[PDB]
Amino acid sequence: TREDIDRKEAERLLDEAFNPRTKPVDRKKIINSALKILIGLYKEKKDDLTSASFISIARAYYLVSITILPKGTTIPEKKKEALRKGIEFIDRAINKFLDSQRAFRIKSVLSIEFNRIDREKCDNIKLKNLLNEAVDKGCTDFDTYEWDIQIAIRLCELGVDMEGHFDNLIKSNKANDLQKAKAYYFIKKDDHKAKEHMDKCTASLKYTPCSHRLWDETVGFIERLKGDSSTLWRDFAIKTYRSCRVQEKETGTLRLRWYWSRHRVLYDMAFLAVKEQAVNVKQAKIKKLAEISDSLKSRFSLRLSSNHEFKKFLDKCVTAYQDGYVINLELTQVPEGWVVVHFYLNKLEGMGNAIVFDKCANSWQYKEFQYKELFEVFLTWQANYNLYKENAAEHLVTLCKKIGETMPFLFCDNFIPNGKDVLFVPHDFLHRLPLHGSIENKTNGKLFLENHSCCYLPAWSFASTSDEYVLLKNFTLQNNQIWGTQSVKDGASSDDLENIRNNPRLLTILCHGEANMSNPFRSMLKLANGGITYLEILNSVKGLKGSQVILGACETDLVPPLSDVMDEHYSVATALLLIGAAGVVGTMWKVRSNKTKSLIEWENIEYKLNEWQKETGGAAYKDHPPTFYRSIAFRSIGFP
Amino acid sequence: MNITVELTFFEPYRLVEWFDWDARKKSHSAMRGQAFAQWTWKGKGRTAGKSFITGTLVRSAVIKAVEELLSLNNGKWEGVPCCNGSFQTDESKGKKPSFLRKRHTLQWQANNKNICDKEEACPFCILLGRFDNAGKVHERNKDYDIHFSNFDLDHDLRLVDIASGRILNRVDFDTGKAKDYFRTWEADYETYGTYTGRITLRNEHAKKLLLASLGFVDKLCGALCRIEVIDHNDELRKQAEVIVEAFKQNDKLEKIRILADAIRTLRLHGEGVIEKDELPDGKGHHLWDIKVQGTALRTKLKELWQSNKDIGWRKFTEMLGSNLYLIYKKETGGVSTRFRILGDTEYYSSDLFIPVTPPEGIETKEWIIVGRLKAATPFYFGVQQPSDSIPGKSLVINEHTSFNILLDKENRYRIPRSALRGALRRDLRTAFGSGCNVSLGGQILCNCKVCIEMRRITLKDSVSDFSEPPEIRYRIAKNPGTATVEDGSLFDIEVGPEGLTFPFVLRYRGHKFPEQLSSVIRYWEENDGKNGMAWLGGLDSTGKGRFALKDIKIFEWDLNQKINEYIKERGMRGKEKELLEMGESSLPDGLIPYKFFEERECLFPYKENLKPQWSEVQYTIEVGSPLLTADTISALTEPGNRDAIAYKKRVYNDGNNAIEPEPRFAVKSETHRGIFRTAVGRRTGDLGKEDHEDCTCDMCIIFGNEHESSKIRFEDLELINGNEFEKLEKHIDHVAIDRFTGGALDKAKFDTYPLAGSPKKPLKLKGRFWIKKGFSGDHKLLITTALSDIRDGLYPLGSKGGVGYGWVAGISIINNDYVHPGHQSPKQDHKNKNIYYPHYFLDSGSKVYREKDIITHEEFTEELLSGKINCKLETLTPLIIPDTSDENGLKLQGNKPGHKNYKFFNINGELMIPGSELRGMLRTHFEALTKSCFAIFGEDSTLSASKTLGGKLDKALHPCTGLSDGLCPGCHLFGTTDYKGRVKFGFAKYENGPEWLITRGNNPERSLTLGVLESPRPAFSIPDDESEIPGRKFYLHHNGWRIIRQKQLEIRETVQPERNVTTEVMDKGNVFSFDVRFENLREWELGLLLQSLDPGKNIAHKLGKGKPYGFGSVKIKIDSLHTFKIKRVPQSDIREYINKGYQKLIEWSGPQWHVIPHIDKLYKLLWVPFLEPDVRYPVLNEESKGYIEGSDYTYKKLGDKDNLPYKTRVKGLTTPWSPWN
RNA sequence: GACUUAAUGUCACGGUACCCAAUUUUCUGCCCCGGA
RNA sequence: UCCGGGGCAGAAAAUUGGCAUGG
Ligand SMILES: [Mg+2]
Ligand SMILES: [Zn+2]
Ligand SMILES: [Zn+2]
Ligand SMILES: [Zn+2]
Ligand SMILES: [Zn+2]
């Protein structure tokens, strides 16, 4: 009939889409066209179609599902939609009926994918029952159908006995190394051959794009191994993390938001593996922990570091950040007397790490802490701040005290020696914490800054003449003769900041600021006319290379309290760091004018920020919480 | 102790099916609706159930109100210092509560003397039930120090009676399109808005606080609330079946869709249209007089209404129209079903405690802005089909109305709280210039500015006090290639009237009234100079939903001081219309007017973000041509029997609180928007491409795609010249005339009712479009270019625009001397002794060239020149164009009853002829000249016998049916049903010359009485079935009008008054001027068009009534020709165009036009000897009136085969100017 | 009473049925021979 | 053996179809 020829054309289209020869961008379009043909046929025949036509509709829906790559955190709703619709249509095909075997094959693969993405809707026992139905209905043909291999591997992973099809599973040419390893591990328990096949898959991972479902499948395999208390999960996690590193080195900066940020649990798993493996060998393990921690920090920002083309790309990055549609130095290189505290908040476990390197002692050591209570207190501080800026100071102090309570090691002499300058490399919400102002949990406790002149760095990759000052006040010391020719005091002339040259040794942007928690790329320095923002800073201003920027603007270093898909800072101060600024004294929240001007008094570029903060009200946490809040807001960012 | 609590809702509260707590996780719809009103089925079948409100939900609302109340009063109530309470159940201590808080908890400095325990606790802990016997698992009802029982609905109970299922939305701010959607059951808040429950309290110390909390619960179940303390369808379907079957019997099945549309629109007319028989009577009627089961359709509908009077007239009309539509769909190959393949995203959504501590002594207050949203434009609030809108219920059957406007349970228009809230959130995000795209199910609150405001803002679902049925806009999509309606592109949208005012409530609860919220409220206000800018609802791009928020009256509850009176008055929740309509003195105790509303220009976010957001460009189109935006569906319902009428809007007038008595004629905002979009996509070529995915064309950024909103929003082109015209709608008759038979085809006669636009009295249509902030200079210049293109008359507005309708006169923000030899017989017979036939035939040939490379309408191709010709009509003999709007225009029927007397065609008192007649004459001349098909042909008409008329005609000569086989040059240039014409003839306007022909014979001067005008008989032209069809019928240029003048009295006396007609007649030498626009026109095509206009110095055209009588022959003079890619083309290039058109004609055959014999025959048919040949029709016999003695020129002599052979007669009818005697 | 609540934790007012579409395309108010 | 006569007065098409989330 007409239905037969229509569905034959749709099946030809789906098969032409199935093979990897076709480009994915047109593969999606031709799968959608085949689905359009099939759905038009289904609508024109309403509820009485040939069973194989319903099976073809379900296969088209599954093929749509297989081409919907998951986003950074949330599974795309079209993926769940197509899986649900395919399952429903193949259920209609099963109720009224080597064709039943392929119907149950498509049903089982659809249900496998639905269980993988939405385990609650397709629970594991129901999936197991339907997988058994499929395998007793002939779903065993390997070396010709990769799907049968998928049912076989899922069945062996649910825990049923699958030793009979092992030989056919392995001899099949269309089985990837991960399915081979799962078969060798789950039914034959051949840990050596499972290790060999997993090593092969991990080596192949160095080239597969992060969008590939093989990444999620191998993360799930190693997760299952870790839950099984297997002895191979550590090496598998470490090697897969090395593969993720080399791959992320070559993915697009847009796909860092989308698909690389998916493999954060993989970095957590590798961190756990190295931590379990952790005298000299132990120190190398500690340094590898630091490397794993730093590899997750500010990767898309690191790629943010002619003009119109870069502006267009930055606009694309901003649209991708908002979940919109886009239209198309070693860690031991610290200078002497400086201690670097690398942080890492493991999300797979409930712990966070504080890998520290002491350069003078050349000593690596980490301490674990519970960041859940500290995170709740930090969110308390952020909510109270966004409601009441200067009246949340008390909470800030509490938060600071929490940093001294959840992290008492910050005040241990053996951890961070007293008097050693500290460079924090925080992770996740610790990026937004005043680690410089942390108060030790002792009677009359001292802040962290008092003992150590502590500066920050969003990631270790950020670490890397003119001798005049170019203050750009837009709010006395504006008439001081130390200000250079390019310095402006009446109108900020944001265009002049775009046109600042000669790599000044210092410049003060005395203006206002807005954090823009909704979109950190429009975090604005309220300069003249249109305020310059993170988007404009990354493109327009180019003079401040090697500069020592001082930011009197409010909320220069304020970020949305909630962590992004990946750990990056997205602040105005980080924006200026991205254009070559050697150091930034950006402000972490709203401040008064008196403290900013006092900062500018400290000419006197070589003077440490810590001496300031000690002198002017920093120690007065019990005396006056508001003066503490005004004091610590100026974190120091950069590397000497 | 224990008290009965009544929870009254004041806007439609959300409802969801009750699920058990463990089973609730299975369904995400009930998982989300944990704060909704619960509904549990009372029996099998999923038909009837009971609606309740979970006592835990009322308890959560009450403890939230206690949190806010204590936070306002520095952590105290009535002098009793409470503690911060506990909202953290440790998992080791016990099981977590079923509902986990994901919001900031209002906290304060603890002033309690001792820690709270079982022995004694603060009223906050008592209201929490912190230290009672009852715990997280219910065992007994006596274990609760505070107990909130279930709240059963106070009024078995069917679900559809209480609730209506509705799809909500999550519209992306950047793209303007909804990311996803979800469905909830908005229950009736009028008949089922009251819920009774019980609250027991054995700890009287907290009692006062509890009662205060009951007064502080602003909203519950998704609705504002006060918490006080004590089947014709089957029969209609059968009748639809019988009606549709009877229509199918008369092969009028396709008319059933039109009938369903008319029946649905009858709901706007009320009962009287059927009971008083206000439907058009007919000249019977083509649709309302169709015989159904033995009776007329109108009488059948009257009987149906009498039988179905039980349901209201509105409901009866909608149900009958829907049933007729559904049955028609069933009989045409099944009813269309909708199925979103991939994107039907029905989406539904880290335990953490965040204590927020407001500073001690801070002042928090409530500003309740009350006003009226006036629909400055026809508003549309979308809703799904009624089948989808049934609670408790996979293809979905597409109902009659493609787009329904959301309505209240009593058919009143509704502005949802959700839609108005989303529009307010978008405007707030604009005002701040910084806001999030709403994240669903987030672990913590969005602390971005817009989210904080929205969490502090509570609106009210508003229902208009106007329940009359919606108006219907029948939007279509034009095919860019053929400029015709796209296949399958047709949809009726229910829009509410403009000017309809809804209540508007906006409660802000917070410390300081924001500059951005005040900026938004000033943005929405119309005030005096600006326009209201609340773009609520949908269809914003087509000017639907621009609401002016007028009658704004902000108030203020000083919550820190006036909390007791606020609780007493319940925040005036459900009493906001009182705040609108009560005096300043009669306010409640704690409510004071807010005198600190910042003015419009004193709000920086308004001036910087909101004011430049939408720039209004208002302009007035002056149209010197009749304007007709067709409303055929509405044309059928209201009387006059007009086939097509000008579109008119139903406009609400709150001054009289009713629809305006005279509807406002306008070019719909959809038509205006489509004209602009076509202009932009033609200048930029953006209309050319078929796919606009991942696409950034200028038209795509300006006008939006399937995935992005529009940066330009078009409003209606309202006619502001209604009072200027005495007869605003001019009845213009039209009829297709067979190319072979000079008669008026069969069924091709029709009429039109366009607005009386004339060059001297043009129509002024004032319309405006809004431009989004951030338009490129290139895009702004492109919009200006499109506006100027409209100004130059490139795109007429409305139907029949290519025939002389809706031509834009403006906006406000050369000769030929070709000599033709003629024919030997008239020139040689200088004595005028010869008598000729009044019409002859052109047998051009069997071969017709069809161009399958159809010229597109999607761009102005550079190789093809577009422009405008100005042509001078010169009448070398009296011309007759009757003003057939009034068949008694001359008012002489008193002397001669039954006589058809018409004035000359004229609009608004100035003398003109329709551009449709000019196009028809030029098209006949062009088809004959280019050997094109008989585009209009009476095939269905039968001839007296072996076969029909269509069989005799050649296959190649047949009218072009579809673009698949291509179109002939006549149908290529002038268009067909599938293809819009690329030539557009305007209404010729009289300029100078003798105004009228004056004949002393007629008692009414300047008028002339014609003879008998009877239908031509193909039997004379085709004497036998074997003989072929002669060809295209043409008439000669002769002075038979002089004969009519000398026999005026004889014609009047001998001919019956009803047999003939009298007309106002032109004189010799009258001059008209008409414009002829063309787009994407070939050089040879333009040359051929110019030649067909002005063929030569002696060749003239024939146009008007009385062509066989020698009337209505005109000379066209091209005095100017402008082209643009606007430069005036010199006569040299014009002659070059005509020469290459001659070359194309020669290539077709395989500048002296007589060389090719068929063109010579055509032009000698149009040759003007004036010489004075005598031409008149033969008489029947030797005894008939008007006979000349001693002449063989009679039809008896020319009818018999023996005396006049059939073949010789056929040859003579094919030979122009042939001597008949 | 149950239907139908769990209680030291419900931002669903946490979510514009939104986005795209020209009621349009073709047509001269025109015209002569037969009927029993 | 006969001396009149109107015609169409809308026909056909569409009546919904799509809605980019990874180069
Ligand atoms: Mg209790
Ligand atoms: Zn208490
Ligand atoms: Zn938000
Ligand atoms: Zn485009
Ligand atoms: Zn044709």
Residue numbers in the entry:
A (entry chain D): 15 to 111, 116 to 296, 303 to 329, 341 to 363, 391 to 526, 532 to 542, 549 to 675, 678 to 715
B (entry chain A): 6 to 160, 166 to 240, 268 to 320, 326 to 391, 399 to 442, 449 to 868, 899 to 1029, 1391 to 1571, ...
The authors write:
The RNA-targeting type III-E CRISPR-gRAMP effector interacts with a caspase-like protease TPR-CHAT to form the CRISPR-guided caspase complex (Craspase), but their functional mechanism is unknown. Here, we report cryo-EM structures of the type III-E gRAMPcrRNA and gRAMPcrRNA-TPR-CHAT complexes, before and after either self or non-self RNA target binding, and elucidate the mechanisms underlying RNA-targeting and non-self RNA-induced protease activation. A recently characterized type III-E CRISPR-Cas subtype contains a single-protein effector that exhibits specific target RNA cleavage activity with no collateral activity or cell toxicity, representing a promising new tool for manipulating RNA. Lacking the type III signature protein Cas10, the III-E CRISPR loci often contain a gene encoding a caspase-like protease called TPR-CHAT that contains a caspase HetF associated with TPRs (CHAT) domain, which is a caspase family protease typically involved in programmed cell death, fused with a tetratricopeptide repeat (TPR) domain.
To determine if the TPR-CHAT protease is activated during phage infection, we investigated the conformational changes of TPR-CHAT upon binding of the invasive non-self RNA target to the gRAMPcrRNA-TPR-CHAT complex. Then, we determined a 2.9 Å cryo-EM structure of an invasive non-self RNA target-bound gRAMPcrRNA-TPR-CHAT quaternary complex. The overall structure adopted a similar architecture to the gRAMPcrRNA-TPR-CHAT ternary complex with an r.m.s.d of 1.78 Å, containing a 38-nt crRNA a`nd a 23-nt traceable segment of the 56-nt non-self RNA target, but with a significant conformational rearrangement of the linker and CHAT protease domains of TPR-CHAT by as much as ~26 Å. Notably, the 3′-flanking sequence of the invasive non-self RNA target at position −5′ to −1′ was non-complementary to the 5′-repeat tag of the crRNA, swinging away from the crRNA and directly interacting with TPR-CHAT, where it resided in a cleft between the linker and TPR domains. Nucleotide-1′ C was stabilized by K187Csm4 and R382Csm3.1, while the nucleotides at positions −2′ to −5′ directly interreacted with TPR-CHAT mainly through sequence-nonspecific contacts, which induced large conformational changes of the linker and the CHAT protease catalytic pocket. In particular, nucleotides −2′ A and −4′ G directly interacted with Y360 and V361 of the linker domain, inducing dramatic conformational changes of the linker domain followed by rearrangement of the H-sheet and C-helix into the extended loop structures in the CHAT protease catalytic pocket. The conformational changes in the catalytic pocket resulted in outward movement and exposure of the catalytic residues H585 and C627, which became accessible to the potential substrate peptide (in marine), compared to the structure before the non-self RNA target binding (in gray).
